[PDB]
């Protein structure tokens, strides 16, 4: 069984020095030093624990080289906040201001009472 | 099956620490590892995240409470006293 060796001078089992195995076209098992597992973006809600959908999950300095559509989703607040909390904020930002209209109407008719 | 007679959650500590100390730890380990009902949705999923930090698994809502129980008797006493003082001030 062909035991094998590192190919850099870092000889410790660190987080940056982690590998996978591969079989080269000259029938030989060789390490390949893998890039770490990038995480998809988390929403700006603070509530939902699932990470966002439709956005690439890459190690973050790659995001220079990806195009715009690969990094957002085609919605208002998209690519930075989940859909459930977008529609919750739409309903909330509507209903608060409708209650504010109701409050100004009630206080204006209480002044008309006076 | 009932696997013990007296020790419950504190049969894990073996023959150690004293009968009175293991019996006194038992109530508190039960109380901090139980899952309490959330008052915000009703699901029985308040787990102790950290010491004084209860957290609902389903609301994703975190309640600062007691160190071993969701709320303390001094806390609910203080809450009733504060709402009584508020209604006596505000009439």
């Amino acid at each position: 069984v062909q035991r094998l060796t590192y190919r850099r001078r870092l000889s410790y089992n660190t987080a940056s020095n982690k590998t996978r195995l591969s079989r080269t076209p000259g029938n030989r098992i060789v390490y390949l030093y893998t890039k770490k597992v990038g995480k998809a973006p988390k929403s700006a809600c603070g509530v939902c624990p699932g990470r966002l959908r439709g956005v690439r999950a890459v190690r973050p300095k790659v995001l220079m080289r990806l195009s715009k559509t690969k990094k957002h989703v085609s919605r208002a607040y998209g690519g930075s906040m989940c859909a459930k909390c977008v529609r919750d904020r739409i309903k909330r930002a509507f209903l608060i201001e409708e209650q504010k209209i109701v409050v100004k109407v009630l206080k204006a008719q209480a002044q008309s009472q006076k | 099956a009932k696997r013990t007679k007296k020790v419950g959650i504190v049969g894990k500590y073996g023959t150690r620490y004293g009968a009175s100390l293991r019996k006194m730890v038992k109530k508190i380990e039960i109380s901090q590892h139980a899952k309490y009902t959330c008052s915000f949705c009703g699901k029985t999923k308040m787990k102790r995240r950290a010491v004084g930090i209860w957290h609902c698994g389903s609301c994703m809502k975190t309640v600062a409470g007691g160190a071993w129980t969701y709320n303390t008797t001094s806390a609910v006493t203080v809450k009733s006293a504060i709402r009584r003082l508020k209604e006596l001030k505000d009439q």
Binding site: - | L21, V25, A64, W68, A75
Partner: protein, 248 residues
């Protein structure tokens, strides 16, 4: 003889507090117009665990009232607070749990924590895990207020300083026995280097004034004066009475 352990704690070499993973200083927000005349609203964003602190912290976001920016801060979480709760604060913030309003307005018998000692210094009194301070009475002229602190002692306070209404979360912490030396180790490692206290008769008489002797005995009386020089001021510093407290 040598320089004893209690003397060496004041040099700050290994006895500094282990404050890397701590979350920040837990302070009330700074006194401005919006808190001196009205009230400002901000929501609790989350509740975090400060290592070395038995009380949980409430990260609360207010809206900055002079430029479009959002301030975030850390409070002592009053017991019963939660996320998504609108904490109000100011002179006209109304009285319920989580708010922080000045002491001269809340009535007598209220239960406040993270209390502010001298007016403006962001909350010093009554801020350990589960511990409160009550408002006893007021004095409208000269604007001071007696406050019963958690030591059982009472203090006259200028009536313009803030206080979080309610007991501190994390209450009732000490009643569970730390069972084992591992729990004590992991407690005091996140606090600071103090835990394996070698008692003084186990030492040699060079580095503690009790050591030596062919019996582990103190020798000299353990109760000693306050004008003892350092390196002697060991054991029962100026005991008024000294025994088991039977009676009050």
């Amino acid at each position: 003889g040598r320089v004893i352990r209690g003397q060496r704690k004041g040099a700050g070499s290994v006895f500094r507090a282990h404050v890397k993973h701590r979350k920040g200083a837990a302070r009330l927000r700074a006194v401005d117009f919006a808190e001196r005349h009205g009230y400002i609203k901000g929501i609790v964003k989350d509740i975090i665990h400060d290592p070395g602190r038995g009380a949980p912290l409430a990260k609360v976001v207010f809206r900055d009232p002079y430029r479009f920016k959002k301030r975030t801060e850390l409070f002592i979480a009053a017991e019963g607070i939660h996320t998504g709760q609108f904490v109000y604060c100011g002179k006209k913030a109304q009285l319920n749990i989580g708010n922080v309003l000045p002491v001269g307005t809340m009535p007598e018998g209220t239960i406040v924590c993270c209390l502010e000692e001298k007016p403006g210094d962001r909350g010093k009194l009554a801020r350990a895990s589960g511990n409160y301070a009550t408002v006893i009475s007021h004095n409208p002229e000269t604007k001071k207020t007696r406050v019963k602190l958690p030591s059982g002692s009472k203090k006259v306070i200028s009536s313009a300083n803030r206080a979080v209404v309610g007991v501190v979360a994390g209450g009732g912490r000490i009643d569970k026995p730390i069972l084992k030396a591992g729990r004590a180790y992991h407690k005091y490692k996140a606090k600071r280097n103090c835990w394996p206290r070698v008692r003084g008769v186990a030492m040699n008489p060079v580095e503690h004034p009790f050591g030596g002797g062919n019996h582990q005995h103190i020798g000299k009386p353990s109760t000693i004066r306050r004008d003892a020089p350092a390196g002697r001021k060991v054991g029962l510093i100026a005991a008024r009475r000294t025994g088991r407290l039977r009676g009050t």
